[PDB]
């Protein structure tokens, strides 16, 4: 039996928040950095406002509203915080601002400053995010480094719920389990597979999986028993763990709760598990106008 989902969908006034700079555009919608001054409360909240690609085809609204449905029903430090929606014309989704953006980009744009303590910490945090979705019986179906966002370089969060489904219910080829490519079976275990690939994107500083190999070939490669190569920086311990996420027997893959444990152990001696050139000596970052006196982060903004 299912418990009743008593999350709150918060409807926001367009006047309660001011935009400030475009962030993303084209591909689908149109994201903005902005601030959100709820009602009368004397707080300001860095937000991302995602108003979808103008022209408002009934198909598009029912699609972002599901995202918001899902995002409103999740609550975990490692899953992207949804603040509310706004019913304007085209429908604004309002989420917590992740100032550092896509984690796939972050790693590409910072290789030379990223060290094992960070890489292993991201691994744990995503494993936690995923374990939590599991707890709430959700299957993400689109885990990848492009779908993890960076709030600060020590703190990442899983995003993109535009494909999430409940387990038991009813295309990014290079991240998918094999049961998924062949029979569209998706399970929490098909999520572990893609975790495997996400981790590999991170350890190779954001390479592209099976660069070259075009998508039609993939199921065949995998069925023959080929997997992605061991990244240069990876000890066999780390790489062994990727490999197990890529087993064919789904039930032989590990569980997110185990990944948490394993990376967490490794995260206590980072340098034993990832061999990075110039590791010891590496520091990373920690946000515009001046009226930043009343700014609180969404993570510290809580609702009764
Ligand atoms: C390639 N990478 C892009 C950088 C960026 O535009 C994109 C389109 C891309 O990401 C994957 N994008 C989104 C696309 C679809 C849904 C949400 C976002 C998105 C968000 C945020 C983004 C930021 C930045 N993008 C943010 C966001 C760029 C740096 C500031 C933060 C953010 O804080 N919350 C959501």
Swiss-Prot record:
Changing residue 92 to R: Found in a lung cancer sample. The record marks 301 as: Important for interaction with PIK3C2B. Changing residue 14 to G: Found in a lung cancer sample; constitutively activated kinase with higher levels of basal autophosphorylation; more sensitive to gefitinib than wild-type. There is a cross-link at residues 21, 42, 59, 62, 224, 255, 265 (Glycyl lysine isopeptide (Lys-Gly) (interchain with G-Cter in ubiquitin)). The modification N6-(2-hydroxyisobutyryl)lysine is found at residue 50. The active site is at 142 (proton acceptor). Residues 17-274 form the Protein kinase domain. Changing residue 138 to V: Found in a lung cancer sample; more sensitive to gefitinib than wild-type. It is linked to Lung cancer: A common malignancy affecting tissues of the lung. The most common form of lung cancer is non-small cell lung cancer (NSCLC) that can be divided into 3 major histologic subtypes: squamous cell carcinoma, adenocarcinoma, and large cell lung cancer. NSCLC is often diagnosed at an advanced stage and has a poor prognosis. Receptor tyrosine kinase binding ligands of the EGF family and activating several signaling cascades to convert extracellular cues into appropriate cellular responses. Known ligands include EGF, TGFA/TGF-alpha, AREG, epigen/EPGN, BTC/betacellulin, epiregulin/EREG and HBEGF/heparin-binding EGF. Ligand binding triggers receptor homo- and/or heterodimerization and autophosphorylation on key cytoplasmic residues. The phosphorylated receptor recruits adapter proteins like GRB2 which in turn activates complex downstream signaling cascades. Belongs to the protein kinase superfamily. Tyr protein kinase family. EGF receptor subfamily. This is Epidermal growth factor receptor. It comes from Homo sapiens.
